Amino acid sequence: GITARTAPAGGEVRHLKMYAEKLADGQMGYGFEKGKASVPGPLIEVNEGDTLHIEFTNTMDVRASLHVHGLDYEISSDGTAMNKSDVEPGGTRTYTWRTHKPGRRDDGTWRPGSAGYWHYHDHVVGTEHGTGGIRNGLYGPVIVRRKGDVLPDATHTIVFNDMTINNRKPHTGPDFEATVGDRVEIVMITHGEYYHTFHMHGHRWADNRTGILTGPDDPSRVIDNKITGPADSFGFQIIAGEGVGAGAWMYHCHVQSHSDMGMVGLFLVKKPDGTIPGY
Amino acid sequence: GITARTAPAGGEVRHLKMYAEKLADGQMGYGFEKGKASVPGPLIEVNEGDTLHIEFTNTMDVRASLHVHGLDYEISSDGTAMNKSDVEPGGTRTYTWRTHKPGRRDDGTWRPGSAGYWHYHDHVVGTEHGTGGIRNGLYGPVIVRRKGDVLPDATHTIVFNDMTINNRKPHTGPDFEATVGDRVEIVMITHGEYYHTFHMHGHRWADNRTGILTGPDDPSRVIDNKITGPADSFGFQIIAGEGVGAGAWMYHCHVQSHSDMGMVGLFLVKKPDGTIPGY
Amino acid sequence: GITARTAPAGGEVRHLKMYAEKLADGQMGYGFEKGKASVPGPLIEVNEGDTLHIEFTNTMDVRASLHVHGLDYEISSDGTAMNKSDVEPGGTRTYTWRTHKPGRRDDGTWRPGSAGYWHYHDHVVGTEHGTGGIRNGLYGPVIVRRKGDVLPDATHTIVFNDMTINNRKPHTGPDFEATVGDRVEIVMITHGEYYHTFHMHGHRWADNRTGILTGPDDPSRVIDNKITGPADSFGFQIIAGEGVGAGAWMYHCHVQSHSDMGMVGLFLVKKPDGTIPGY
Numbered sequence: 001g002i003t004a005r006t007a008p009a010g011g012e013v014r015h016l017k018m019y020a021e022k023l024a025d026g027q028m029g030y031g032f033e034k035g036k037a038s039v040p041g042p043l044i045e046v047n048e049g050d051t052l053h054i055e056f057t058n059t060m061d062v063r064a065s066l067h068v069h070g071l072d073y074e075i076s077s078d079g080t081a082m083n084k085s086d087v088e089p090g091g092t093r094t095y096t097w098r099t100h101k102p103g104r105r106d107d108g109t110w111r112p113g114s115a116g117y118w119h120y121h122d123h124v125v126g127t128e129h130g131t132g133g134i135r136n137g138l139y140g141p142v143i144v145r146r147k148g149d150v151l152p153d154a155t156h157t158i159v160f161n162d163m164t165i166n167n168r169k170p171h172t173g174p175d176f177e178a179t180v181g182d183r184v185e186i187v188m189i190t191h192g193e194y195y196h197t198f199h200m201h202g203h204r205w206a207d208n209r210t211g212i213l214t215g216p217d218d219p220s221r222v223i224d225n226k227i228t229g230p231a232d233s234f235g236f237q238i239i240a241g242e243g244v245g246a247g248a249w250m251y252h253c254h255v256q257s258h259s260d261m262g263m264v265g266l267f268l269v270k271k272p273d274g275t276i277p278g279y
Numbered sequence: 280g281i282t283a284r285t286a287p288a289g290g291e292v293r294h295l296k297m298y299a300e301k302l303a304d305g306q307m308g309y310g311f312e313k314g315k316a317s318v319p320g321p322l323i324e325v326n327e328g329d330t331l332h333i334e335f336t337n338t339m340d341v342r343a344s345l346h347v348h349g350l351d352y353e354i355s356s357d358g359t360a361m362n363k364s365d366v367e368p369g370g371t372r373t374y375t376w377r378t379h380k381p382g383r384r385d386d387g388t389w390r391p392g393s394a395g396y397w398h399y400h401d402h403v404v405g406t407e408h409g410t411g412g413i414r415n416g417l418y419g420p421v422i423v424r425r426k427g428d429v430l431p432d433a434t435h436t437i438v439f440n441d442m443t444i445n446n447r448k449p450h451t452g453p454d455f456e457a458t459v460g461d462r463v464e465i466v467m468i469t470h471g472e473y474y475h476t477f478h479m480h481g482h483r484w485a486d487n488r489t490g491i492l493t494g495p496d497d498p499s500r501v502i503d504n505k506i507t508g509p510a511d512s513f514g515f516q517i518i519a520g521e522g523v524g525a526g527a528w529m530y531h532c533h534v535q536s537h538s539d540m541g542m543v544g545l546f547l548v549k550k551p552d553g554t555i556p557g558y
Numbered sequence: 559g560i561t562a563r564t565a566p567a568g569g570e571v572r573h574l575k576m577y578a579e580k581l582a583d584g585q586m587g588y589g590f591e592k593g594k595a596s597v598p599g600p601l602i603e604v605n606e607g608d609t610l611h612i613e614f615t616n617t618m619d620v621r622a623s624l625h626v627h628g629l630d631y632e633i634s635s636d637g638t639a640m641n642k643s644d645v646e647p648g649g650t651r652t653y654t655w656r657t658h659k660p661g662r663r664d665d666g667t668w669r670p671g672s673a674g675y676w677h678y679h680d681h682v683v684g685t686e687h688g689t690g691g692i693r694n695g696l697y698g699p700v701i702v703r704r705k706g707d708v709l710p711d712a713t714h715t716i717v718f719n720d721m722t723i724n725n726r727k728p729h730t731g732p733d734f735e736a737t738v739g740d741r742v743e744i745v746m747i748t749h750g751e752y753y754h755t756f757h758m759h760g761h762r763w764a765d766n767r768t769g770i771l772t773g774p775d776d777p778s779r780v781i782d783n784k785i786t787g788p789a790d791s792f793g794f795q796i797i798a799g800e801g802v803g804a805g806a807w808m809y810h811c812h813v814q815s816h817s818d819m820g821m822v823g824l825f826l827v828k829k830p831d832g833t834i835p836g837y
């Protein structure tokens with residue numbers, strides 16, 4: 001676009017602290033600040049070409065780690081036990097993530113860039129595949145922008161983790177709010193044991209990298225329903241209420257017993273007066 | 280194409296009656312006419328820009344509704360209990376579905392059009408997610424054509440609903456018939472509890488919006504096998520017997536115990552004399 | 559590309575022998591030579607336009623067959639019981655597979671070519687859907703190249719067959735080896751009863767036909783995680799260790815209990831001295 005904000009060229013070196021901690025109720029979560037850990041962990045958004053040094057501190061009583069999808073990392077920052085890149089209790093390690101722009105290789109072929117919707121999670125809590133860590137909440141989203149990507153007003157993360165959304169008790173959302181016309185970005189991630197189908201009432205997106213059609217040539221299927229499995233991640237943007245107006249629009253897993261057993265939430269799209277028709 | 284028939288520009292306002300009724304054997308189905316209800320319900324095909332007013336009448340003894348994927352609807356035509364848009368027994372409600380062409384937004388971005396393979400189903404029978412209604416047969420296909428889309432000779436709907444095809448008893452098809460050379464469109468929909476993989480012997484299509492490659496630039500994978508989950512919908516066209524000739528070509532779920540337990544049917548492609556080699 | 563090797567135009571008629579045999583331990587596998595049967599069966603790679611005549615011999619004590627995805631075959635070479643194209647014990651049959659280039663049809667539309675990542679398997683051992691044959695190991699990969707496709711240094715086949723990789727005992731790989739910079743092709747196939755998610759540490763590919771982006775216009779999502787179901791097949795190429803260096807990079811099903819129960823292997827990327835950092 002040319003009036004929406006778009007991502008700039010990347011290439012910063014960025015530093016950042018993360019903590020893994022046990023939560024009072026038995027869950028585990030990441031944070032940028034000790035005592036401010038969340039499930040999902042905080043969004044990490046960078047631009048293609050950025051380099052990110054994460055001073056990670058495991059504050060728990062068991063070994064834990066930080067593993068990322070899609071981004072360039074050396075085996076040093078694998079986050080696995082095998083490759084000795086996990087972290088002892090109370091320990092601190094610096095993971096490094098790099099990203100790159102697309103371009104021609106010398107053999108004439110086209111190297112894909114790092115741009116996309118990704119995620120990070122533990123790889124050593126409970127099992128050598130982080131099964132316990134993931135079940136407990138050690139997962140969070142990563143976004144890598146390509147230069148020129150359209151930027152949203154807000155970004156929400158929805159994680160189907162086993163039979164929960166964002167580790168919440170059945171039928172407790174989360175719910176999100178927008179005003180009609182808002183540019184809303186969704187990062188959607190699945191974890192655990194089961195397949196799901198993500199569905200949104202009243203909105204749809206493109207089944208490509210960005211969730212947006214480039215222009216009239218993009219043959220990508222347009223959808224409002226997408227099957228997902230453990231560690232899948234995709235994202236998209238929509239205009240809230242576009243062509244459909246305000247309302248309490250559901251989103252849910254469309255697997256019938258999942259939605260029945262509580263994998264449901266609300267996308268509350270409001271008129272400017274903050275009202276929602278019949279809610 | 281330029282010799283195949285193609286869809287015209289849309290923009291009609293269309294009216295239409297639908298009924299939901301209980302069938303003699305305990306199933307539930309939609310119809311355009313009372314007493315002519317089917318599972319799957321009738322195809323609804325429109326053009327991008329069309330508006331469709333459906334005079335829906337619930338003739339059953341329990342509340343029922345009509346919910347659609349992909350198409351523009353206001354929350355009034357949500358078809359959910361929450362938003363008060365379901366229908367009392369013997370009641371009548373007018374749902375409205377709109378569709379739109381793609382184009383530029385003012386922010387410079389590209390709005391996707393409504394064009395695609397979609398579906399409709401109940402959202403309130405049995406549970407607040409229509410689990411009972413869907414299991415009983417309250418589902419049907421919707422097609423939205425983009426101006427210039429290639430039109431087929433015939434359109435067949437295949438629905439993997441839990442462990443059945445089109446709610447049929449195991450190993451009872453459906454079977455479809457074509458003559459070699461026919462342009463056959465398939466709308467494929469999944470419902471219920473399970474994932475599946477749809478497979479066709481002897482034919483293949485594009486994994487994009489239409490199931491057809493635009494021309495040589497379309498990088499879409501060409502496939503004869505596709506994993507699907509509850510509420511997924513896609514469609515495609517093939518030339519019957521193209522490059523392979525007449526025959527009784529199977530289609531089935533490729534999940535091994537599903538095909539074994541009966542999720543199988545026949546695509547009977549005939550020579551002009553109506554014969555099928557070795558059948 | 560223009561320095562990588564690329565596939566030539568097709569159109570050869572090729573002949574070839576295959577055998578199905580029972581293995582000493584109770585499995586079943588295909589081979590190009592009697593006594594040299596493998597699970598997965600040997601790669602069959604051809605060019606668009608090639609024709610392949612396979613002199614198939616069933617050396618087992620039960621009926622068996624050869625069924626292929628994606629490629630053109632007449633119903634004579636269906637490989638099914640129904641269509642009488644399976645093979646009696648000790649019997650010999652000649653299957654024929656053809657392939658075609660894409661191009662314009664007379665109706666003006668675009669016929670897709672045969673190019674892609676496909677597979678072959680039994681259709682009659684154990685059940686009329688080859689459930690027993692597939693479980694026992696009667697499956698192998700097929701690659702059809704389009705003229706101009708980039709050719710790799712090596713091609714590896716990974717098959718998630720029920721809860722095994724390539725029918726191996728849990729936690730026994732397979733492992734693959736490359737040197738940093740190698741062009742590695744992966745053909746990934748799923749069989750049996752379950753869905754999976756294929757994941758690779760440290761590498762990513764395009765979710766299109768080839769696994770490679772054409773250039774900057776290709777909107778295909780770039781991924782390192784892909785959900786798959788029975789009879790799904792896709793493929794891709796990566797540069798070993800590109801942007802990430804040498805190391806013992808894991809690949810696994812990301813379904814948590816699968817990786818835990820053993821669906822894991824190693825992509826061993828080496829420095830030229832053959833060493834792998836921390837292994």
Ligand SMILES: [Cu+2]
Pocket residue numbers: 123759808810
């Ligand atoms: Cu891993």
Ligand SMILES: [Cu+2]
Pocket residue numbers: 160195196197253254255258259263
């Ligand atoms: Cu679910």
Ligand SMILES: [Cu+2]
Pocket residue numbers: 199200201346347348
């Ligand atoms: Cu819906």
Ligand SMILES: [Cu+2]
Pocket residue numbers: 067069121231757812
């Ligand atoms: Cu992961």
Ligand SMILES: [Cu+2]
Pocket residue numbers: 201250252402
């Ligand atoms: Cu719903």
Ligand SMILES: [Cu+2]
Pocket residue numbers: 439474475476532533534537538542
């Ligand atoms: Cu199935």
Ligand SMILES: [Cu+2]
Pocket residue numbers: 478479480625626627
């Ligand atoms: Cu097949």
Ligand SMILES: [Cu+2]
Pocket residue numbers: 199254346348400510
């Ligand atoms: Cu639905």
Ligand SMILES: [Cu+2]
Pocket residue numbers: 480529531681
């Ligand atoms: Cu079959």
Ligand SMILES: [Cu+2]
Pocket residue numbers: 718753754755811812813816817821
């Ligand atoms: Cu698995």
Ligand SMILES: [Cu+2]
Pocket residue numbers: 067068069757758759
């Ligand atoms: Cu990983």
Ligand SMILES: [Cu+2]
Pocket residue numbers: 478533625627679789
């Ligand atoms: Cu098959």
